[PDB]
Symmetry: C6
Subunit: 335 residues, 6 copies
Amino acid sequence: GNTVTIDFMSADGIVPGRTPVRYQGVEVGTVQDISLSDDLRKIEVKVSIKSDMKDALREETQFWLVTPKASLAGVSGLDALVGGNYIGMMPGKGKEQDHFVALDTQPKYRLDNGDLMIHLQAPDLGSLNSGSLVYFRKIPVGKVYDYAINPNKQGVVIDVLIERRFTDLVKKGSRFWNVSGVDANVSISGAKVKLESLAALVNGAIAFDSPEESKPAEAEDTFGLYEDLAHSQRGVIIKLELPSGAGLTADSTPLMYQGLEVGQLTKLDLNPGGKVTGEMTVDPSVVTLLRENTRIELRNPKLSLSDANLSALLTGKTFELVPGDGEPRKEFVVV
Amino acid sequence: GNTVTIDFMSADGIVPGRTPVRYQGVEVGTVQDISLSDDLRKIEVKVSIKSDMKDALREETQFWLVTPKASLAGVSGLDALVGGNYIGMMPGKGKEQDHFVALDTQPKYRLDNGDLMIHLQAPDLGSLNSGSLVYFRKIPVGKVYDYAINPNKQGVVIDVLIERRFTDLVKKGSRFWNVSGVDANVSISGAKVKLESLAALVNGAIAFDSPEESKPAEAEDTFGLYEDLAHSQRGVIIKLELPSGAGLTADSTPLMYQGLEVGQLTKLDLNPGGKVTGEMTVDPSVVTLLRENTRIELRNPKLSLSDANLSALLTGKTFELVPGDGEPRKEFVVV
Amino acid sequence: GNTVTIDFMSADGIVPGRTPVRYQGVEVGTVQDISLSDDLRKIEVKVSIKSDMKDALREETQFWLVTPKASLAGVSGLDALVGGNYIGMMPGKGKEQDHFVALDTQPKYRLDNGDLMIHLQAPDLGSLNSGSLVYFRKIPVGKVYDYAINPNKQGVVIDVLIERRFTDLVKKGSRFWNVSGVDANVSISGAKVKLESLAALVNGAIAFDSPEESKPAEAEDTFGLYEDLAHSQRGVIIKLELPSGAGLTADSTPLMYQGLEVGQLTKLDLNPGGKVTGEMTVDPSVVTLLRENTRIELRNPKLSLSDANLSALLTGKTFELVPGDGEPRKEFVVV
Amino acid sequence: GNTVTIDFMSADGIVPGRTPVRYQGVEVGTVQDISLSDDLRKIEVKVSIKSDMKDALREETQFWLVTPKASLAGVSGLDALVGGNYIGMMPGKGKEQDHFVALDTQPKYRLDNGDLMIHLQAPDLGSLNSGSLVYFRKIPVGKVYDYAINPNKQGVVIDVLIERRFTDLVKKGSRFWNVSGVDANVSISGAKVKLESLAALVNGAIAFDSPEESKPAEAEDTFGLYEDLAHSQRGVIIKLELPSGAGLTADSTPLMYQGLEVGQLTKLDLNPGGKVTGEMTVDPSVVTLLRENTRIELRNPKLSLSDANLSALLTGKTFELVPGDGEPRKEFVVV
Amino acid sequence: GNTVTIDFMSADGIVPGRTPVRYQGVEVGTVQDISLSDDLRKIEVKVSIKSDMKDALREETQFWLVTPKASLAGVSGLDALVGGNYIGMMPGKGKEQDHFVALDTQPKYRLDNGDLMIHLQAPDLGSLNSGSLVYFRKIPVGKVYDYAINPNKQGVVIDVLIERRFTDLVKKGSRFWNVSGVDANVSISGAKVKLESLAALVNGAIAFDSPEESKPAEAEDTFGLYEDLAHSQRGVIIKLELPSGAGLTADSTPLMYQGLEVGQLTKLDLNPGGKVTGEMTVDPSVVTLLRENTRIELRNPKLSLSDANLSALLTGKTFELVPGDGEPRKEFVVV
Amino acid sequence: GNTVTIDFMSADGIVPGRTPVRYQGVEVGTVQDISLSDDLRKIEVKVSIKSDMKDALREETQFWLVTPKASLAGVSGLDALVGGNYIGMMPGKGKEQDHFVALDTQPKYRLDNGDLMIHLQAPDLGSLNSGSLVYFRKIPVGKVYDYAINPNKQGVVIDVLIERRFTDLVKKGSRFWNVSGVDANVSISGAKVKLESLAALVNGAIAFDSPEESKPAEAEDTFGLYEDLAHSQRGVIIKLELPSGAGLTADSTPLMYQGLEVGQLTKLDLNPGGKVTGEMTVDPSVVTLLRENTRIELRNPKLSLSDANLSALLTGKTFELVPGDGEPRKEFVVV
């Protein structure tokens, strides 16, 4: 039994009856008192901590309020069924101390038990919450640990925690993508809807791939987070100089070869001077064919009277590949 | 232990067993008695407050009944699972006082702990409730604190509270928009639905942008609240003098250039004299092109027999940009 | 401690353990006994009331059973989670009395604390329950208090209660309309669904407008309740003498002027003699144009080969306005 | 304290702790024991009843097990949240008796407190459960009390209970119809969905009309239960002798007059001899026009090149009325 | 108080505090101990049974673990709200015994209290669970008692239990069909969705018909279980020798007569030799017409220019009946 | 009463009040203490185990933390209603031991009580969780026991547990397929949706077939897991050498014979050299017809003016079978 005062901003969800001090999920302390200091809305919380932790307690010790995760019941309003709050701590070397300032948020992942801590760089957080789940072959092999805006305001850094035995799965050449929320598609000539898993709808998810021959990633290695499985397909970036973007779509325009979809127009820009230029990811089995005097030309959805097909008219503009021979080149001009 | 009488209008959710007086979330008092005074339906509530707050208690002290937020369980009818009521207080200098009049609503945000309090001006409240959430890069960085009708009855003022560390995000040139409720779209040549986040469906949300070079906003700075992300896009307002509004739509009519969508007709009016005039927000990369003898003329969805495209007929009227050279001008005449 | 006997029809939800007598939400009494009298299914309920209310208790005192509101959990069947019943009372001058007859329903709103009590006249109740909510700029400023059939059986009178500070909002020229339930629309050339707020789906809602210059309404002033926001638009009623109602729709037929929608056919009748006559609400900015030799003639959706537009064929018959000069007239003849 | 043995078939939901004997909702008795008699699965339940009811208890006393209503939580499987069972009784003159046989179901409505008990004759029960609700102007004015198959197996008799003050609403010429479940419609030239109320989806409902001048119904008067509001419209049955039923629909074929929908083909039969004959309900304002040499002839959806209307082709076959003069007749021949 | 040991496979949901031994729903025993025997995972459960049942307890006594029904809350994961387990018993003549082997499942229906036990033969279980409900005129008149695979593995036998008073409803010529799950239909010229009842969605249901003149079925009489109400329509099987199955559908091809749908192609096969043969159920009122030189020939959906009907083209191939005279025949040849 | 220390990684859901040690579902032990050892985040848990298990307790004893299954309430956030954790054990011969290391996951299925343990090889886990259900004729005859990635990272091995009496159902030639999640189909000429069972939506399911004459499988026999019932149809693989894949679809292209669907194009590849080759599963009744000079040629959806059928144009390319005579061959060339 001891007395430790922690200064908080808001006394919400802190009850002297049952609010534990869970260090590593272990009930170490118990909140005793909540008093107020009037200046800058200081909240003095008196907490009784056990004996050996008291001799472990030192000046650099981090306390922070922990609230349950953002859930469906929490946005529904069922405050009786979600759970309870606790406060967390991390002892540091420091000096002898009695008065502690609370932390605004969770401290950085310091501990080492073999779990892998890697960083993901997304343009926004998406449907991901802290505690959303990471899949490999739709098997949960980790979780989203934390997220924070980078110093440049452009991005969100989401750092995730792969479990110990699955660390061999993550490679240098792994690609991570986002599987969160529901997308319903209406497709021509019939429609079928199978988007994503049940847990990924409510909370969000991040799935990833493991390539065949790559060195295993380690120790806070960064990764780009793609927004879709189709955005994370491998292939070769091919620059195109388009005449106009009249019927061309950012991600819906295919590259046909022998009637089969080989590539996908992935980017479409209006460069100054009035020059529409785009670029296209092609499948690796076809990258042998891309050479000098290999032409890529766009086909109109022409009206066919002899073979009445609605699919050709519904798709629209369609890039056709005609192969050639010579040195491999990687940028073409469409006329 | 003390006796303080507070006069309320309706004695609902006030039980002498468990109704606390939460000052800054801190259980200070406890309701002791509810008696009625017959004139004007006065309700005398006797409340026992602690000792140091009693010597802090003074004449300008604001008490008000606090009810849980409007939730899905509250509109569902689960009154056993939502929570409980409390009353709130704010001590002021004043004089010695025993008899207090309750307040109809929450008092204005007085305290200063570094959190930013800014005002938003909307034409209506929308799906926003008090306690709905404010996002930056889909990261919750604040909350909607209060809302009130302005003295002119035209508007709703919604004042929100950005947290202390995220105050640097809000700038003078920031734009806020509304992300609340579900919109389902049926698009031509296929349909895909990804509107908004899960928490924003039930309660509502306000997202915002941070520009690159602007002075940081502070101390009750006002902002317009756009209703949509598309309504909050930057660009240049261009006045147009239209012949008629025959196939033109308020927000669905694009400005093509080189086959790419550059601008968007945003407003369409019938001025007296029978003169249809509208205006159009264009993208900044194109604002270099808008000059004298630069024409903006509308194209019909003409029926094409050689290239059978359904997209041209489904879109309809389409503003085409043809650039020219000279002094930049910002209002055009469509014929 | 006293003994008061109240005679009820059905002893449902009345338990001697916990059934309070909430006068103005204040727990005054407690049910002691339930016995039966056999004639006409009389139910004698013995109730112990406090001392000062006992000297306040007099012959004209109204007791009535109060049941929780119709909720989603009540129609779901969760009788454990909804709540509990109580009985209500209203003391009147009267005489000394011990035996009381219960009331079938809630008594009329007698008390005066500044809240406004106005009446709304609807053809049916709609999705409105007692306790549904009244909005101004989507801000809840009152509630539906009671509803009852008028002596003519044609109507429903719904009397609502605007709160004290918002009484200035309600004017003589205010229009109230109904925002309750979900409507999903499929629109041509794409579809978008944003109907109404979340709380209005489950329980129902009434929104209203406040005009600019009108005297403020007071003291049980009646109002018509429109069923839709489009039905509550201001404008001028214009009588039309139609040839036939061949492609004309009750509320879906527009009045074009300069290609813009100005008015809306609102009523379409077959008067005896075989004379189809209708009427049309026009926008006030156009009411200057309606004059002698101003013609209103209907346009067919003619098939256009030069400009292929599906919108013209999908809309159908379309009233066109051609303006003229002279004395203003308000009834026209369509040929 | 007494001992009364009641023989049941299945001892389900009968606990000696809390199972009351609710006579008219009043807790009269309490289950004491459950023992089994082996022959024909007899279940002897010992029940302690109060003193005055014991001297009231006589040989013709009906006991029956009461189970909560069929709810959403009961089909969901939430057996902890629905409620509890009780048994019911009705004392009759009889003789002194100790041993009672339970009843399979609820006894017939015997009591008289002014509530109206009328019978409805439907071809099947529909979505109606016992305890579903009866509406007038969408105001709940009664409930479905019981249902039973008539001695001819063709029908279901549903007997309902209108409350005391609303007995004046029910007339001899009242029509009752069914408002239960959800119907979603896809309409041409746009689609809008507003079917029914929220409580009617889960449990079902019966709405009814009150005519202007009719004698008020009383004392177990029968009524047909229509399945739809459109099936309950008043009008005149008109027999038609059709050539064939080639494009004619059972309820979707209208009778036009002056371009307005006047009547509705309601029945379509193939009489032996190969004679397709149908019948049609017409609106009363038109019944003046139906006379000798008044012809009713069907129009094809002919393809119109000058006025391109999709509505005419989407509707199909359409009965046209051409009026004449002479004696009124009520059966016509279509050629 | 006694000691009875029962050997179970898995000790799940068996708690020594509250697990009763419900014989015929009557709490007879209470679980005292759970110990393990190591060989073949034997679980010795000690149970204290009452005195008279102990003298009733004999060697052929069947004990089996009973788990709550498969519910929505059980698949949702709400294990706190579903309920509790019990074990069941059936005493048999036998000998004196102390050690009992548990049963894997429920024993066969032995008892006779007038309830009817009939068998249904389905190709699969469908959405039916044990405890799903059986309807007549949408009135619940029984329940699904048990289900088991027959010795030939082709089928599922589902044996159901009609209640005592409704035994007269079930006849020899009754047909049972399946009403379980939700089917949503998109119909041409408009769409309307009313499939099935609310309880049948979650758990499943079996409805049935009662013919007019048939001997009442009894004592484990078998019945085929049709999968749909349309599959259970009466009529005459008519064999057809088709040219090809080019536009013919298994259940969507109608037999027209006088423009009315009379029959339905119900089966379509490719017999060896390359001979497409099918068969068709026709309505009984038409079976008088089927004779020698009565032809059944298929009509193409020919394009009609004079009468523009989309319904003819949307339906497709259509069997037409042309009647003749002579001896009745029941197999035809389509050319 | 004893003392056993178990070292865990994270002390979550381990409370000294109620956390049992369920060996084979039997409450053997109870958690006494949670202390921390600082190095590598060791968590010492003291557990009191019963006497006979203590003399059974030996060095190879496996302890592991067990968490409830992934449920809808667990992803919803209802942590109060899901359940509680326990730890599991398996005694092994070993030596005397006091200090135990916890296991990361469930140990392999060691015990033998007649239940069948077979392995399934899928490319990903799908919607299957541990504890999802296995169906035969939609009858639950087992469950998914465990899942783990194979040493090659390509696959997921899911090992399932068929119950004792249903072991005869599983054969060598059985095929298992996946019935998990909801698929909604929009079909031409009308749409109907009946995908899968209610329990399979939330948690997932695996159904399987039992062939007629096969030896019964046993003792960890592997099986491929098909993703669909259509992917698991028997038939003969037929290699095709296609000209191009212009209108051909991976699984939507049928093989017609006599107007009936016989086979299905199942695979479509672009082999290097620019050679599109595919393969097709045909029905066994037709495999007699596949011979030398039997041609398989693709038909265009040609526009038919005499017989206006939308189905032919909506389907598209269609493989036609024309049979011949000679030796049976299994690979064809399409021109």
